[PDB]
Coordinates of C-alpha atoms in Angstrom, one line a residue:
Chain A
X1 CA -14.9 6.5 22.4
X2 CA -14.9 6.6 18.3
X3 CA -18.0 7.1 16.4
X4 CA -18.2 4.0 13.9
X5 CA -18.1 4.6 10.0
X6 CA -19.5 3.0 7.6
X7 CA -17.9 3.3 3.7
X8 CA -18.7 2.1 0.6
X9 CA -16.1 1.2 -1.4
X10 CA -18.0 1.2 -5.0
X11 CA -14.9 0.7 -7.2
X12 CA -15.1 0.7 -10.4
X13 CA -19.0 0.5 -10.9
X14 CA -22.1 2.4 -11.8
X15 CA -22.1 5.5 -14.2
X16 CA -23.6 8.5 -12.8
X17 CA -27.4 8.6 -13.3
X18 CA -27.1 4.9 -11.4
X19 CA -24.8 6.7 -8.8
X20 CA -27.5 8.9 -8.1
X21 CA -30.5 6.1 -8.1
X22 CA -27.9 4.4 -5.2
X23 CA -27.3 7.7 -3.4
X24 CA -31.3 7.7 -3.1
X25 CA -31.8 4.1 -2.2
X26 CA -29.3 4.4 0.9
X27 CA -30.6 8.0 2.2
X28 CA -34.8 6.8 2.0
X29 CA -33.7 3.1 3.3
X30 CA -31.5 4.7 6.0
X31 CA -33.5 6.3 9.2
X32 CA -32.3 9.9 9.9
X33 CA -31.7 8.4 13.9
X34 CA -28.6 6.2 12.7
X35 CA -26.6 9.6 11.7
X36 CA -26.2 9.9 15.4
X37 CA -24.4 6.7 15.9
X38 CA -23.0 5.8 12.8
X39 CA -20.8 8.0 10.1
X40 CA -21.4 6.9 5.9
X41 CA -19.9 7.9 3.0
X42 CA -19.9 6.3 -0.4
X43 CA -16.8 6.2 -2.2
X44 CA -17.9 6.0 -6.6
X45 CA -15.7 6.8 -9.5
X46 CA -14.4 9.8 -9.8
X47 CA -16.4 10.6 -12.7
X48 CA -19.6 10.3 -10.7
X49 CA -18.4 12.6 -7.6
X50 CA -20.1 15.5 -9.3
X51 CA -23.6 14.2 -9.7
X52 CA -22.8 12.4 -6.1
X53 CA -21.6 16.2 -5.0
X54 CA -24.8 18.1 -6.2
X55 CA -27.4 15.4 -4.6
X56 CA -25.4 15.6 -1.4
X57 CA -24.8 19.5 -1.2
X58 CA -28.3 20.4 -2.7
X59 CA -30.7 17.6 -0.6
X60 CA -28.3 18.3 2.6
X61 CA -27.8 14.5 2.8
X62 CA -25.9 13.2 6.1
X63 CA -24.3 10.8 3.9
X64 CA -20.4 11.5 3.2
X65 CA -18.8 10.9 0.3
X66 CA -14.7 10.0 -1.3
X67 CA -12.7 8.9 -4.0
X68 CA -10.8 6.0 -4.4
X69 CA -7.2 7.4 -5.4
X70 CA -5.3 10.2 -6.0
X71 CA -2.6 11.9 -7.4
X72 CA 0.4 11.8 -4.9
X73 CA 1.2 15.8 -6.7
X74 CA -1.3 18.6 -6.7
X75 CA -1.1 19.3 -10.6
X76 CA 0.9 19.2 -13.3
X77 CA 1.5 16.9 -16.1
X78 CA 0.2 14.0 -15.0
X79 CA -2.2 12.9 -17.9
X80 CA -4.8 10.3 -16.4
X81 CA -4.1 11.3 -12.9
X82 CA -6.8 13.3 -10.4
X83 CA -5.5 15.5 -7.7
X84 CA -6.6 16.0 -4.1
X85 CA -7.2 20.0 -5.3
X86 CA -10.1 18.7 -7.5
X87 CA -11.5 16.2 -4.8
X88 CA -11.3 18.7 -1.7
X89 CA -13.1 21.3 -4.1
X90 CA -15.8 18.5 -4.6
X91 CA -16.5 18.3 -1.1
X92 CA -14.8 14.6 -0.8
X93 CA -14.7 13.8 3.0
X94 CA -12.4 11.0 2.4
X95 CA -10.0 9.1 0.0
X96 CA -9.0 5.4 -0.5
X97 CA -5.3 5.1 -0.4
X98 CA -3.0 1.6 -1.1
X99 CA -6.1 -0.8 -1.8
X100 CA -4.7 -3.7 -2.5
X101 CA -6.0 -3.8 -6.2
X102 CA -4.5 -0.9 -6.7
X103 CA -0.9 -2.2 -4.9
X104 CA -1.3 -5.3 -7.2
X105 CA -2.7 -3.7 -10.5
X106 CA -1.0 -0.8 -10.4
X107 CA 2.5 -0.9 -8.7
X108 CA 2.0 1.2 -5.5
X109 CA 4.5 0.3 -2.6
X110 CA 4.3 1.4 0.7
X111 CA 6.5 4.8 0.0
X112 CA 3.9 5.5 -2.5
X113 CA 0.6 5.0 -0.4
X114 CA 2.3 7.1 2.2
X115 CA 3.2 10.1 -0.2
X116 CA -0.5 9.9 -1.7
X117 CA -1.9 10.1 2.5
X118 CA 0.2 13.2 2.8
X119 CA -1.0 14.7 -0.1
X120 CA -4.6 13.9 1.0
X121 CA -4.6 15.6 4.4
X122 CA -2.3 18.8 2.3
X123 CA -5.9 19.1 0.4
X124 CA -7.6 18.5 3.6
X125 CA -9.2 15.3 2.9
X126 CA -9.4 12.2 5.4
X127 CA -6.6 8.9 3.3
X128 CA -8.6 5.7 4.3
X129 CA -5.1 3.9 4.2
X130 CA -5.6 0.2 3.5
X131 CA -3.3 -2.6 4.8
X132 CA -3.5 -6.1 4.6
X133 CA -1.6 -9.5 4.1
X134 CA -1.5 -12.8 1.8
X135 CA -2.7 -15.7 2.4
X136 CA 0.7 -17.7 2.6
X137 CA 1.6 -15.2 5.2
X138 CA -1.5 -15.9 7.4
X139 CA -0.6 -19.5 6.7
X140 CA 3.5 -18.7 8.3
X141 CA 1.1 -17.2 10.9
X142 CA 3.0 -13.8 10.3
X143 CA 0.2 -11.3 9.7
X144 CA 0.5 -9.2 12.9
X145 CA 4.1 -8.5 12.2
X146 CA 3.2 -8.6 8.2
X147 CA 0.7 -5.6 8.6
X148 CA 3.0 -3.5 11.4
X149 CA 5.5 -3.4 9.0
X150 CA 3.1 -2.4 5.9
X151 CA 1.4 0.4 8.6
X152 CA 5.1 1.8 9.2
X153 CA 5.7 2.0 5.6
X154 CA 2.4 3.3 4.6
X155 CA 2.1 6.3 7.0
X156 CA 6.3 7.3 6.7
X157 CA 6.7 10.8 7.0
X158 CA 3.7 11.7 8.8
X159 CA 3.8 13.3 11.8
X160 CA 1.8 12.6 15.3
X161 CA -1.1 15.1 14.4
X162 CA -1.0 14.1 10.9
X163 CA -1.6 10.0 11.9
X164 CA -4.3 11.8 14.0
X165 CA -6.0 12.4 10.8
X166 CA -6.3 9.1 8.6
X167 CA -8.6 5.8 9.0
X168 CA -6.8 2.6 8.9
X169 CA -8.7 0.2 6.7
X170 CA -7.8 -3.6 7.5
X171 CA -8.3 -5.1 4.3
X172 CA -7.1 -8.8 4.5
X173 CA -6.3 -9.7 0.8
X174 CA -8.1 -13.3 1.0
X175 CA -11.0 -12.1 2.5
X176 CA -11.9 -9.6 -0.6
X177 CA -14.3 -10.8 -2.9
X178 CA -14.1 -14.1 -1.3
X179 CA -16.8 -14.4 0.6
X180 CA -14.5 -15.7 3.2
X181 CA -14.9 -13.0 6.3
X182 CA -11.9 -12.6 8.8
X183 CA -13.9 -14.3 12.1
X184 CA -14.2 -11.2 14.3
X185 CA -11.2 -12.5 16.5
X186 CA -8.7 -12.0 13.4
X187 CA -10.1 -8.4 13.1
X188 CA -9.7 -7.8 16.4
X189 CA -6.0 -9.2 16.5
X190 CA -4.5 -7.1 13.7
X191 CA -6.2 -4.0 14.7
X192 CA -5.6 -3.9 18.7
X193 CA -2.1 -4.4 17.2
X194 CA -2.5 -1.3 14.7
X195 CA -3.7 0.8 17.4
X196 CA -0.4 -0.4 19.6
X197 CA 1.3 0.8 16.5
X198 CA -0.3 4.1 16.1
X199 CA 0.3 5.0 19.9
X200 CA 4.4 4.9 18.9
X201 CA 3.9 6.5 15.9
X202 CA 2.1 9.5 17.5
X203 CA 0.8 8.9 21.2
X204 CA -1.6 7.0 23.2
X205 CA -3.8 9.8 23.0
X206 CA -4.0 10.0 19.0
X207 CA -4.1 6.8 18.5
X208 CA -7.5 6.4 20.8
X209 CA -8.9 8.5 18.2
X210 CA -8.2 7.0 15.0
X211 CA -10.9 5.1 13.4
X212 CA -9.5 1.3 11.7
X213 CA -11.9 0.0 9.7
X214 CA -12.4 -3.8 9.0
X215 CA -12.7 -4.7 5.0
X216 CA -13.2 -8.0 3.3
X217 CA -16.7 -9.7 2.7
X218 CA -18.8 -7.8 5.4
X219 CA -22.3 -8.7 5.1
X220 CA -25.5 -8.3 7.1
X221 CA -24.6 -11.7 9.4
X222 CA -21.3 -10.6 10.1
X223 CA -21.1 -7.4 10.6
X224 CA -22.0 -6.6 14.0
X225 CA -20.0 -9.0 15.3
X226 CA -16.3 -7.3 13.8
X227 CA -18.0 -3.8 15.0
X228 CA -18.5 -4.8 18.4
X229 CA -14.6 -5.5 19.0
X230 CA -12.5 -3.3 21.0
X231 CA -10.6 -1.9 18.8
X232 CA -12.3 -2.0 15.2
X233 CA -14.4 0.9 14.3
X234 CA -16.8 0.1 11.2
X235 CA -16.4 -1.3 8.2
X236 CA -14.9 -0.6 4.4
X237 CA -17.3 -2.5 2.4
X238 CA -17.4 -3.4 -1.3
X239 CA -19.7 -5.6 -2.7
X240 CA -22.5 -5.4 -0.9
X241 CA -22.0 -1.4 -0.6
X242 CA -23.8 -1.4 -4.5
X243 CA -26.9 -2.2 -3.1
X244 CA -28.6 0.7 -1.1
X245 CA -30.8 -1.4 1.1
X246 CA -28.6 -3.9 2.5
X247 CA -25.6 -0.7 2.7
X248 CA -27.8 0.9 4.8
X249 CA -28.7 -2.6 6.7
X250 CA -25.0 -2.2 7.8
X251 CA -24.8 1.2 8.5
X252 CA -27.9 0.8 10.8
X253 CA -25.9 -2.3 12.7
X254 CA -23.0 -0.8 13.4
X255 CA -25.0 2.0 15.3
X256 CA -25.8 -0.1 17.5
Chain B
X1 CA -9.0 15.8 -47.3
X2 CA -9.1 14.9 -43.4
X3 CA -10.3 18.0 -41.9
X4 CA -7.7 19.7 -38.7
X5 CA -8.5 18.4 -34.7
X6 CA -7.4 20.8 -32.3
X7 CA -7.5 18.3 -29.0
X8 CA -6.5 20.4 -25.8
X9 CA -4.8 17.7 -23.1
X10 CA -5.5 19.7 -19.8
X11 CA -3.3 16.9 -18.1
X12 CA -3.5 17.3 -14.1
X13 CA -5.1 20.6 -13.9
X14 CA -8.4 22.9 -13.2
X15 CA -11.3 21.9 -10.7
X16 CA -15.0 21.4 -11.7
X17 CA -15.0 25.3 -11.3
X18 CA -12.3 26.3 -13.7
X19 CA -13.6 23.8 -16.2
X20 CA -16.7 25.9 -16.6
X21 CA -14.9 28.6 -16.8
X22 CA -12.5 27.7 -19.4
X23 CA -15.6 25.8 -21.9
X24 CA -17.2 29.0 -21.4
X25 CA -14.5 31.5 -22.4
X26 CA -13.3 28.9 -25.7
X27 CA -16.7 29.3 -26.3
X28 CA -17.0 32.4 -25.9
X29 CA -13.4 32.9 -28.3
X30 CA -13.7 31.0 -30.6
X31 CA -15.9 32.3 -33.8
X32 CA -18.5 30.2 -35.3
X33 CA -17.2 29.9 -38.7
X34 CA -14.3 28.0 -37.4
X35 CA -16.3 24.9 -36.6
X36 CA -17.3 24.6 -40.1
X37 CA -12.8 24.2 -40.8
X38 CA -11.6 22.7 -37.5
X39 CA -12.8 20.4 -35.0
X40 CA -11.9 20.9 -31.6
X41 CA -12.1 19.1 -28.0
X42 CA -11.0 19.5 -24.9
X43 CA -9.7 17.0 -22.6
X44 CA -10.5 17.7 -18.8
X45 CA -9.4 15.5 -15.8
X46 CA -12.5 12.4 -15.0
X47 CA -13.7 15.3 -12.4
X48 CA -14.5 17.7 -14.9
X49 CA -16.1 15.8 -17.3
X50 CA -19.8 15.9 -16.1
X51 CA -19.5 19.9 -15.6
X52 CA -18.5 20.0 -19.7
X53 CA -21.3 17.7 -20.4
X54 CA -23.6 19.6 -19.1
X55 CA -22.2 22.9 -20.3
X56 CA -21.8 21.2 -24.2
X57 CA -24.8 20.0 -24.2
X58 CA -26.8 22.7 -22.6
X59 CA -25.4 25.6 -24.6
X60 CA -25.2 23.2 -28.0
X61 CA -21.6 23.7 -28.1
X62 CA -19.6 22.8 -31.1
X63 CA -16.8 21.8 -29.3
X64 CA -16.2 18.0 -28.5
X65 CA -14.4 16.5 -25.5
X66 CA -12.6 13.5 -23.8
X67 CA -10.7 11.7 -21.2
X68 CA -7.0 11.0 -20.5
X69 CA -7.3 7.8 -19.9
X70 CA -9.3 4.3 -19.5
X71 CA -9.3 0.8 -17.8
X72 CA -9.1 -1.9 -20.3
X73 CA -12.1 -3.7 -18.6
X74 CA -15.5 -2.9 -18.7
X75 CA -16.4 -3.1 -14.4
X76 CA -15.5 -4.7 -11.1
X77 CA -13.0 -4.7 -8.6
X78 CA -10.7 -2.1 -10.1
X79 CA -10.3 0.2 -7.0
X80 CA -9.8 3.9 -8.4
X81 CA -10.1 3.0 -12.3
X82 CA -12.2 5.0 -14.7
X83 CA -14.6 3.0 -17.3
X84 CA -15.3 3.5 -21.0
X85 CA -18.8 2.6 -20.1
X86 CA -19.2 5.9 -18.1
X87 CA -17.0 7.7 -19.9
X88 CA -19.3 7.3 -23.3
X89 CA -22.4 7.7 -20.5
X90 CA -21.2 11.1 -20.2
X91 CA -21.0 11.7 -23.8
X92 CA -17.1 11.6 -24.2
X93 CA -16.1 12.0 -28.1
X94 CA -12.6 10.9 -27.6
X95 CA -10.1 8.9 -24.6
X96 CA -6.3 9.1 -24.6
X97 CA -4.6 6.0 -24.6
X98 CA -1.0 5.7 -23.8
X99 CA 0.4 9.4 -23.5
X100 CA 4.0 9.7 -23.1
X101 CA 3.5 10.4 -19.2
X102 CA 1.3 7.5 -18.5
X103 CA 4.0 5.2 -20.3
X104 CA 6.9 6.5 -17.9
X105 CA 5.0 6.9 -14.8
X106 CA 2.4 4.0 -14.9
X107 CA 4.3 1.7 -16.9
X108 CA 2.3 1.6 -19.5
X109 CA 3.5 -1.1 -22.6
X110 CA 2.1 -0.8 -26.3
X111 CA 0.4 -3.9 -25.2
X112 CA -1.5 -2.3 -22.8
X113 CA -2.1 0.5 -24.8
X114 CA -3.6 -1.4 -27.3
X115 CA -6.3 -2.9 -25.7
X116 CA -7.5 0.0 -24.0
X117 CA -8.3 1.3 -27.7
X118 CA -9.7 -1.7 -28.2
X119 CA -11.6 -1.2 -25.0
X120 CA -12.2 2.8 -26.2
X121 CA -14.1 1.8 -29.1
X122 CA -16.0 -0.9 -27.4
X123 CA -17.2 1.9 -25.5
X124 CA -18.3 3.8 -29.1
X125 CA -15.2 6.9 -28.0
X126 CA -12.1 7.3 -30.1
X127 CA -9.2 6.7 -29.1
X128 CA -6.2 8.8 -29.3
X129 CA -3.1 6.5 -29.3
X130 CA 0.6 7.9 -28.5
X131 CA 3.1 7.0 -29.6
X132 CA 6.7 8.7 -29.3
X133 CA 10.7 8.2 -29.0
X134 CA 13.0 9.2 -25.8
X135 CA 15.9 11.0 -26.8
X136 CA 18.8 8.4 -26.3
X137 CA 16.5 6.7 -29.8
X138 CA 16.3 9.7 -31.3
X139 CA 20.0 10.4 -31.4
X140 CA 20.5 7.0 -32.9
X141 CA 18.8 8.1 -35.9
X142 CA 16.7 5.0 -35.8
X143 CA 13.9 6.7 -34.6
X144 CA 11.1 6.7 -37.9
X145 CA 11.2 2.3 -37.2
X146 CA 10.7 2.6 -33.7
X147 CA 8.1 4.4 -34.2
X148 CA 6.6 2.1 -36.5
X149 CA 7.2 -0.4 -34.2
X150 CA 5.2 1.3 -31.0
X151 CA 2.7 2.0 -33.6
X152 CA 2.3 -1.5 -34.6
X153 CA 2.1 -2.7 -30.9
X154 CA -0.3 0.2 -29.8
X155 CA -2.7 -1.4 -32.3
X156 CA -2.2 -4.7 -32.1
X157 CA -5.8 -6.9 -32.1
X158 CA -7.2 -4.2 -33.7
X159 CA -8.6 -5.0 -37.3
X160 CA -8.4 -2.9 -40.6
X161 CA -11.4 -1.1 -40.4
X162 CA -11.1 -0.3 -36.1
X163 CA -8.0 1.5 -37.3
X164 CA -10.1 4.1 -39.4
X165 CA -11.8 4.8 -36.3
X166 CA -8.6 6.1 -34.5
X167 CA -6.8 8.8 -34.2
X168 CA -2.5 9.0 -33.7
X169 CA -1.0 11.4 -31.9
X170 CA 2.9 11.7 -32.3
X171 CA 4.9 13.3 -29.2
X172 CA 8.4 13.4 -29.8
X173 CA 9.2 12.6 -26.4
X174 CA 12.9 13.5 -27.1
X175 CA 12.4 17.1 -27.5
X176 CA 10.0 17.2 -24.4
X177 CA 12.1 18.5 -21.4
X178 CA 15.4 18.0 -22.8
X179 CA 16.0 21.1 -24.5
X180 CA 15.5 19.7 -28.0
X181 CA 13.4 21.0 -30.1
X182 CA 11.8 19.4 -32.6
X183 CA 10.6 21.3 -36.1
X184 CA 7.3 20.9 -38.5
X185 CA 9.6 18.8 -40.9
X186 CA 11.2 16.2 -37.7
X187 CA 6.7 16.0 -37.1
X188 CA 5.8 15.7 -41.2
X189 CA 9.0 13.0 -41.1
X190 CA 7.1 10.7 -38.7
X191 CA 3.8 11.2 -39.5
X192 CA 4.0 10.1 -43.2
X193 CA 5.9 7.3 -41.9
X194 CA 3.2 6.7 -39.5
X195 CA 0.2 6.7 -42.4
X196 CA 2.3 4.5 -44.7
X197 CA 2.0 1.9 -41.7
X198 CA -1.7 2.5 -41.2
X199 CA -1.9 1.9 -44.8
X200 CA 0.2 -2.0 -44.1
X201 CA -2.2 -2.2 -40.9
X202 CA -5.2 -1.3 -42.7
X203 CA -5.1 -0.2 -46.3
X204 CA -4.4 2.6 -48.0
X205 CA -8.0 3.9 -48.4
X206 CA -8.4 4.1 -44.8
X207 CA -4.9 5.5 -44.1
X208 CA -6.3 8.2 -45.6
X209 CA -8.5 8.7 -43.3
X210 CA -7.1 8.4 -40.4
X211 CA -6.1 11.8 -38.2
X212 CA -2.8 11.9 -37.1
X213 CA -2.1 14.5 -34.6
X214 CA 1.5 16.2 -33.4
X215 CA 1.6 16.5 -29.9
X216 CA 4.7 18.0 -29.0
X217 CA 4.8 22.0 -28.1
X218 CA 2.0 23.6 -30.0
X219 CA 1.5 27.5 -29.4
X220 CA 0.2 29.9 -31.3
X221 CA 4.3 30.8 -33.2
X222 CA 4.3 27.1 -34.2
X223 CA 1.0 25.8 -34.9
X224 CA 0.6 27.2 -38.8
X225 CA 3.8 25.2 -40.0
X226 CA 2.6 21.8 -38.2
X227 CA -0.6 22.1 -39.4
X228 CA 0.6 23.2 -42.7
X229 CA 2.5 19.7 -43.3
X230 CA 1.3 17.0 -45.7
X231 CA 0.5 14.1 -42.8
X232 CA -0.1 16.6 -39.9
X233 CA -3.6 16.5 -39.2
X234 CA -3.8 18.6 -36.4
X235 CA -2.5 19.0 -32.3
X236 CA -2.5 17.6 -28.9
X237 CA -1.9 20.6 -26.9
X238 CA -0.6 20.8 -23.7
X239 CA 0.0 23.7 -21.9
X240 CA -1.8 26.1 -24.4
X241 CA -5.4 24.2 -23.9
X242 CA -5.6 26.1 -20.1
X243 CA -5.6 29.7 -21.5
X244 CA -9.2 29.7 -23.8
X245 CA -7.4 33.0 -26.0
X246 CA -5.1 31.0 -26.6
X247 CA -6.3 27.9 -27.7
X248 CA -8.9 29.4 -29.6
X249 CA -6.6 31.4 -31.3
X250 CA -4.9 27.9 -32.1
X251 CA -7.8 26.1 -33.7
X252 CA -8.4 29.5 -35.9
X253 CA -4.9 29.2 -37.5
X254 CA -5.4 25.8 -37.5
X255 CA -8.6 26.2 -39.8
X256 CA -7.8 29.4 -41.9
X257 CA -4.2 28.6 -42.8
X258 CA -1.8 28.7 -44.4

């Protein structure tokens, strides 16, 4: 079985004396008895991951925590850019890598996302590797063999035990922001057909322990509905990861 | 006159660990008198910057810093981008805005780059804008007007009096890598081209004002004769900025002269 996670995609909001208010809000809203049953990490800004760091490290929260990019290099000159070195040192659990804002806004293909996953498990860190299609492709009814294609492309180069290693994140690009949730059957679909994927790219037995997330408008209504499918295993939540109370709402229904 | 900046561009390197390290030993280099002659900042990656905060403001440190970058919008969903809002939060003086590097490896147009300094000093930071020519320009000889022309796009929306709150940095891309080198005199040619342009942007009066900053190689060999020029106001520095000696040592011959 795979232990469900829970992660808060914050992009780009809240300075850092907020990201500590939210921090606090999740970890006294939150009952220490979910930490059993559910894993969460909150994913801020990078320039909020030390204040985020220091709460964590020196209140021994169970609450995880990640960034939402990184360097594909370890150093160098690479003004504007944050490595996997400085995360990892940080304590960062986990890393976002190919959201689709950042495929759209920023011009990362698949070779890219899959150089940046390699250099996140080099540093240690666990790539949250995010896949997902257009709505005119849902519309040719082509997203199963849309997203295999993008999940090939994205994890290139890795090797079985290094697939072993990353979450899958099912982001389906209509459904972010939207407020228009995949129904729990779409998630389902496209990730019984990303674990199929993952048992060629490694084995059967990796791929029964990789965690693939659902993303796109999860709210308290929906969410246990997506958990409880076979082969989804939590949830990569924006919006409504801002607010502590109803974050840890989630966290606490995908439990179970 | 316009007094010298000393700006230290870590680029991609140092942990939250090193960062202390490094604020502690330029402070620890660097005499007090110099302050008083030369301002200087350092520019750590978006990790760093709380550590320097709280290291600067703790220890009343005379030294500034900044960022190496910034969205042009203010919040939302922007997966891994960086805000002014936060960045002044954490009481940046200064954000780069289109460095040579983020031009050829993010794409970034003078467009762009123009209204993230808009965006900068939204924020209340100043921006430092880049601007620079590849070699194949360079060997053209047309390289003073392209110049010009990158510095007229970088600042494009921006009115007269946002432009005295800037600060130029020059990097003449063409001798970066290529195994050109480029003198005091090829930096004092373009910046006094540059301030003549501020002066058409703006006015003269605030031309005057305005710091304009080489940023190819600086080092400690090199850094008198840039300084020492008419329009050169001062350094980006690269590589230098990771050893505190060193770049201490920079912003002291930057301050004492010649």
């Amino acid at each position: 079985s795979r232990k469900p996670l829970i992660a808060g995609n914050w992009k780009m909001n809240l300075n850092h004396y907020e990201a500590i208010a939210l921090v606090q809000k999740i970890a006294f809203s939150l009952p220490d008895k979910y930490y059993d049953r559910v894993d969460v990490a909150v994913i801020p800004p990078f320039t909020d991951l030390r204040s985020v760091q220091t709460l964590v490290d020196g209140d021994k929260l169970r609450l995880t925590y990640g960034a939402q990019d990184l360097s594909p290099h370890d150093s160098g000159a690479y003004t504007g850019d944050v490595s996997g070195a400085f995360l990892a040192k940080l304590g960062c659990s986990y890393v976002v890598v190919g959201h689709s804002e950042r495929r759209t806004y920023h011009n990362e293909d698949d070779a890219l996302v899959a150089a940046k996953a390699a250099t996140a498990l080099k540093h240690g860190l666990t790539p949250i590797v995010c896949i997902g299609e257009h709505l005119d492709v849902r519309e040719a009814g082509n997203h199963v063999a849309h997203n295999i294609e993008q999940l090939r492309g994205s994890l290139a180069g890795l090797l079985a035990e290094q697939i072993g290693s990353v979450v899958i994140a099912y982001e389906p690009v209509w459904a972010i922001g939207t407020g228009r949730v995949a129904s729990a059957a779409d998630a389902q679909e496209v990730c019984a057909a990303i674990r199929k994927e993952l048992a060629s790219l490694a084995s059967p037995r990796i791929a029964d322990t990789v965690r693939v997330l659902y993303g796109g408008s999860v709210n308290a209504k929906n969410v246990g509905d997506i958990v409880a499918q076979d082969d989804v295993d939590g949830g990569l939540v924006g919006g409504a990861s801002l607010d502590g109370e109803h974050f840890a709402t989630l966290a606490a229904i995908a439990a179970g």
